[PDB]
Design a protein around this ligand. Sequence first.
Ligand SMILES: Nc1ncnc2c1ncn2[C@@H]1O[C@H](COP(=O)(O)CP(=O)(O)OP(=O)(O)O)[C@@H](O)[C@H]1O
Ligand SMILES: O=C(O)c1ccccc1O
Ligand SMILES: [Mg+2]
Length: 541
Amino acid sequence: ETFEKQLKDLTSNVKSIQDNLLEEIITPNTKTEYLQRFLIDRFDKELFKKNVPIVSYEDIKPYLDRVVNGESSDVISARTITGFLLSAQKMMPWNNKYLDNLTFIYDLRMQVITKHVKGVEEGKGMMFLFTKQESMTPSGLPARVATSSYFKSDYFKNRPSNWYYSYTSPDEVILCPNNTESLYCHLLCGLVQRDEVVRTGSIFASVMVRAIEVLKNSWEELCSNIRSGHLSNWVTDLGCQNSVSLVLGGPRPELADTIEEICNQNSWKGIVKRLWPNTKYIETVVTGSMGQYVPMLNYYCNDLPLVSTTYGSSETTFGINLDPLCKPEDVSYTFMPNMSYFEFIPMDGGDKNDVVDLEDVKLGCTYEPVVTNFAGLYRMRVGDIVLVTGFYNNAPQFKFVRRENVVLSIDSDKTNEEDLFKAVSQAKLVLESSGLDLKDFTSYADTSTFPGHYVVYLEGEQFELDEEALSTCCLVMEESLDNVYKRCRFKDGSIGPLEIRVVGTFDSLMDFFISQGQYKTPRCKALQVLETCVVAKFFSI
Ligand SMILES: Nc1ncnc2c1ncn2[C@@H]1O[C@H](COP(=O)(O)CP(=O)(O)OP(=O)(O)O)[C@@H](O)[C@H]1O
Ligand SMILES: O=C(O)c1ccccc1O
Ligand SMILES: [Mg+2]
């Protein structure tokens, strides 16, 4: 009752609260070096739109680094920057207004969920929530990933006491920095209290999959812990030791025999549903690139709804999905006007404007969002493309389409098409030194097996094919990847060895581009013919 009303109020005078919100942001911030440079000496919208440039991270990074290294927040924000968010790797400024906003959305999405999902209030979530450790900055302020700034905060520790915030995992397991340990412990605790599990998931679908893969590879050992009442010794985190011990409590040979039997069936089909029969849905994002995990999650889960709830970034949370048990391709996020002041740059002829406000976007037009927040970012380009699909009252509904500049992404890692071409060029110089000359390049992401990875097709005085000289390539291609990438390749254990598949098959593919539609090389049916044109495969290590 209150819900329908709250959401009605919130989607209705959108123009208003967005101006009021702009007002709240700018006014204190006439005090900042950054706004003083653009002559913003009072609150004025048009003046703001006139003088404040629309920027990218590179443009403002010189400001953000000064705060990173210890200058006053006031260079960019009059609200103290109390920390940073990690996406080299980039650092967005951050304060508790992010957590105010995040928890507002958590509360809003829980209301949406129970409104659509029968019987969720009568159990616990097995959530694979992970705390990653903070880098420190010279200013002395921590840098954390988005969810981690939430966990290492009282917004989590003192979170509401009710179904949506009740997990089968003690908080020590969620807050453990070693995710190898804590993923195991998630699975152990979830198994021990398996009847109470009415939902499961993670922030993104790749973690759901990795969790099911760890389960497949660790179930024997999980049951031995359940049999003995003892956690496996290798888990060192003291918090996991004590807390997951109280959960085990004692020997459970009976419950171990029970789960051993479910796992031992021929097929892993619907294994999730068989170990956790009261599960009603999987709460994990499967929009954007994450949609490629849908077939394999539907395999393991027996076509349980995959609910994608939220759209968000380090700049801001944008909004939520108000039709949660719809299909991934049909998902739209209804931006929430109390988060940040949103603007939008048209990306098709549908909107011939230079830039437009939230309440001004046109139906069926595509746009790159533009964020102004409560932590020092002003008119910052987000680098997503969204499509306007509809309107809840006066609040628009967006399809997430694409990330403006990417080639491949198999997890947390974002490998821009520039950091991708940092390999087509990079390792080539050493093919050059031995009697080889590169021909072409193009990348794909494989989800044939877990862990997926990056697919890459490359092109007298002998007989077989050279290995020593060209297996180095793949291993020095990787060295060109980002930090967020490598982390997942090894420590998250979410990606395998990178690889190349040797295939004049790109003067041939060039005709496979006029065949369906001046033409320059691409960043990411097509494959059946390209798949064929290969003679060998190699690994890096
Ligand atoms: N529900 C969702 N659906 C589809 N994409 C989502 C999403 N939630 C987040 N994302 C994607 O993840 C991005 C925000 O993540 P961040 O926390 O900023 C790490 P990043 O993507 O590496 O940032 P960067 O590419 O700007 O450096 C969004 O731009 C969006 O592209
Ligand atoms: O669940 C979250 O906290 C979240 C945060 C950022 C982006 C998407 C999300 O679901
Ligand atoms: Mg960005």
